[PDB]
Structures are given as structure tokens and as C-alpha cells.
């Protein structure tokens, strides 16, 4: 995944 912090 990209990640929720991007």
C-alpha cells in the first residue's frame, strides 16, 4: 500500500 501518511 501507499500508506495513510502520504
Amino acid at each position: 500500500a501507499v500508506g495513510i501518511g502520504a
Epitope: 500500500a1 501507499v2 500508506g3 495513510i4 501518511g5 502520504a6
Partner: antibody, heavy 118, light 113 residues
């Protein structure tokens, strides 16, 4: 070795709360996000949400808002998921998984079984 | 969010035969750069999910070359050119491009012998 150690099986009464823990080992806790995944025979795998330990920022799928709340403790390198006002549909197995930004769910926790029953 | 529809729900396969699992997304799952965070996971009972494929076609470390992934548009496929006994379990596609992230419904692979 990388390790994600989850807490053991729970029996929780309906309408109560429980906190699940996931302790990271063998890597820097703040360098990865922590994600939570629900598993049931009826709905398979469901993404619950995630937390960035370094900042405390969180995100959730809409149906888990108000049901799950994620926190992280940098001092003990342990992520937490609190499940609140439990019903029988909260009986499941819950996993944690780490994520480096732009990478993948490479290491998973052992899994925690929760049974909501009076 | 993004709906991931997987087919079939159960796949009975003979040992040594070929297996193909399809995953479709309700909307584009291309991230803003043109990269696609489509992943495949396997779960055997009593065990944790295990990563197989990332970014549509790349094998995770230690995954055999008979397992491969591909996809164009909103259609994605996981393929096993020669099913072996240890491939049994439930396969899940996973969309990691758009929050909230979503899984497919799962495909149970069952081996014939």
C-alpha cells in the same frame, strides 16, 4: 528477527470494551505504519484502519469509525486497537501488520481471537 | 471506497494443473504517479495472511516463479502455472492506492488428488 506479538484470546461481554495490543520487535517502531485487519468466515478480510506511530495520525474505513480507535505508544513500541460497545458481530480474529511507506504488508501479527458473549 | 470483486469464490484444481484468479476494481486504482498498488495475499487456516504479489506483477521475496500477477485497466489476475500441494488456502487481492484500503472477497483454492 522482525516480530509483531499480539495479545491473547479475549472473552468480552456485550456492550463492553476491549483493547488489543501489537508489540513490534527487531525494527524501529516509528519507521512503519501499523495497520489492523479483521477476519471472519462471513466477510473474509477487512481493512479496519491504520496509525502512524510517529505522529499519531489515524484513518479508518467508515463503518469502524466509533467502533475502533487506534493508538500507539512509542515508549513501549506497542500499537493498540480499542473495540468499543461490542456486539456479536465483533466476534472475529484481529491481525496487525506493519507498512513502510510505499511498500506492503510484509510482516503480520500472530492474531487475536475475540468472542463477545454474556 | 473501491470495491474489489474476486472470482471465482472457490477453485478446485488438480495437482499439477494451472490456476487463475481474477480481481476487478470498481474504479481506477492507479496512484497519482502512475503506479498501481494491487497486492495479492494468501491465508491458510490457523495462520496469518502472507504477501505474494505487490504492484500488480512483482513477486515478494521467496515466492516461486510459477506464481505470477498481471493486470490492465481495472482487471487483475493471479496465476499459478503448476499448482502444488502447498498452494492451498484463501487468496485475496488487495487495493492499496486509495484510502480506505479494501480486499476482495477471497478465493478458496482446493486441491484434487
Amino acid at each position: 528477527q522482525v516480530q509483531l506479538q499480539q495479545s491473547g484470546a479475549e472473552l468480552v461481554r456485550p456492550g463492553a470494551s476491549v483493547t488489543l495490543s501489537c508489540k513490534a520487535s527487531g525494527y524501529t517502531f516509528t519507521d512503519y505504519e501499523m495497520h489492523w485487519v479483521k477476519q471472519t468466515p462471513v466477510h473474509g478480510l477487512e481493512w479496519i484502519g491504520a496509525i502512524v506511530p510517529e505522529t499519531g495520525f489515524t484513518a479508518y474505513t467508515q463503518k469502524f469509525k466509533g467502533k475502533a480507535m487506534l493508538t500507539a505508544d512509542k515508549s513501549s513500541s506497542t500499537a493498540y486497537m480499542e473495540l468499543r460497545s461490542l456486539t456479536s458481530e465483533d466476534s472475529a480474529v484481529y491481525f496487525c501488520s506493519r507498512l513502510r511507506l510505499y511498500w506492503y504488508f510484509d510482516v503480520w501479527g500472530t492474531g487475536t481471537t475475540v468472542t463477545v458473549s454474556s | 471506497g473501491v470495491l474489489m470483486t474476486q472470482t471465482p469464490l472457490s477453485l478446485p484444481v488438480r495437482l499439477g494443473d494451472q490456476a487463475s484468479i481474477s480481481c476487478r476494481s470498481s474504479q481506477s486504482i492507479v496512484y497519482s504517479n502512475g503506479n498501481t498498488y494491487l497486492e495479492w495475499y494468501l491465508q491458510r487456516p490457523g495462520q496469518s495472511p502472507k504477501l505474494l504479489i505487490y504492484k500488480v506483477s512483482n513477486r515478494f521475496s521467496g515466492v516461486p516463479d510459477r506464481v505470477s500477477g498481471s493486470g490492465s485497466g481495472t482487471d487483475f489476475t493471479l496465476k499459478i502455472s503448476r499448482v502444488e500441494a502447498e498452494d492451498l488456502g484463501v487468496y485475496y487481492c488487495f487495493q492499496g492506492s486509495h484510502v480506505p484500503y479494501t480486499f476482495g472477497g477471497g478465493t478458496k483454492l482446493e486441491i484434487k488428488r
